[PDB]
């Protein structure tokens, strides 16, 4: 709970990581706007099932009422998918590794109307992760912060857990040998990225709502309700 060491907090978070899943990309045919949206949302839908279970493993999360768990996840789900994607994409300049068999560049983004500008923000965020040399331990911290933070001012136990994740991030930076000044500077650079992720999430949400509204792709019931939660 709140009695975790920094390291216990890190291990629990590394342990709780979801799998990297595959898309059902079919290479026999070219992309259309509809089949690409079909692929992306099919993937997101399956990742969502793992996210629900992952979140229950984030310290403190299951201590909340079921209504607050619903609320935080509904609020943060696309942010979490997005920060996962960006982390998966760190090693692939100019590309987004949605799945190991679904690696897309900006020109493939152009297949879905409105999509390429969102690809671009995601690609830039991946470069930022790259230039910063974001570590896996910092990533799992950030992703949990997103879960607990993004709906929290749709309003104190959550602030104590959030405080503990901060302690943990600092501890890692201290453990990686950064100076005291570098610790707060990097702490800030990392958290400021969450602003960019919220933004991409808001545009992504707006875009998906638009695809649904044009009947471009059928959405699973979960995805649908996750989307209604927000247009």
């Amino acid at each position: 709970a709140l009695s975790l060491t920094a390291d216990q907090m890190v291990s629990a978070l590394l342990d709780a990581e979801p799998p990297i899943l595959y898309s059902e990309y079919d290479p026999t045919r070219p992309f259309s706007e509809a089949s690409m949206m079909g692929l992306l949302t099919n993937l997101a839908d399956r990742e969502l099932v793992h996210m629900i279970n992952w979140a229950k493993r984030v310290p403190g999360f299951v201590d909340l009422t079921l209504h607050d768990q619903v609320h935080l996840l509904e609020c943060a789900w696309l942010e979490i998918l997005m920060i996962g994607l960006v982390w998966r994409s760190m090693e692939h300049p100019g590309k987004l590794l949605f799945a190991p068999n679904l690696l897309l560049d900006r020109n493939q983004g152009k297949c879905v109307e409105g999509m390429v500008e969102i690809f671009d923000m995601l690609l830039a965020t991946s470069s930022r992760f790259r230039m910063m040399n974001l570590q896996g331990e910092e990533f799992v911290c950030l992703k949990s912060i997103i879960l607990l933070n993004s709906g929290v001012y749709t309003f104190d136990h959550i602030h104590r857990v959030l405080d503990k994740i901060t302690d943990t991030l600092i501890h890692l930076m201290a453990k990686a040998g950064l100076t005291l000044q570098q610790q707060h500077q990097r702490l800030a650079q990392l958290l400021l990225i969450l602003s960019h992720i919220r933004h991409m999430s808001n545009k992504g949400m707006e875009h998906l709502y638009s695809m649904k509204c044009k009947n471009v792709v059928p959405l699973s019931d979960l995805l649908l309700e996750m989307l209604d939660a927000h247009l």
Partner: peptide, 11 residues
């Protein structure tokens, strides 16, 4: 309840 309120209960 919404779909998610019930998946959140699976163990």
């Amino acid at each position: 309840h919404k779909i998610l309120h019930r998946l959140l209960q699976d163990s």
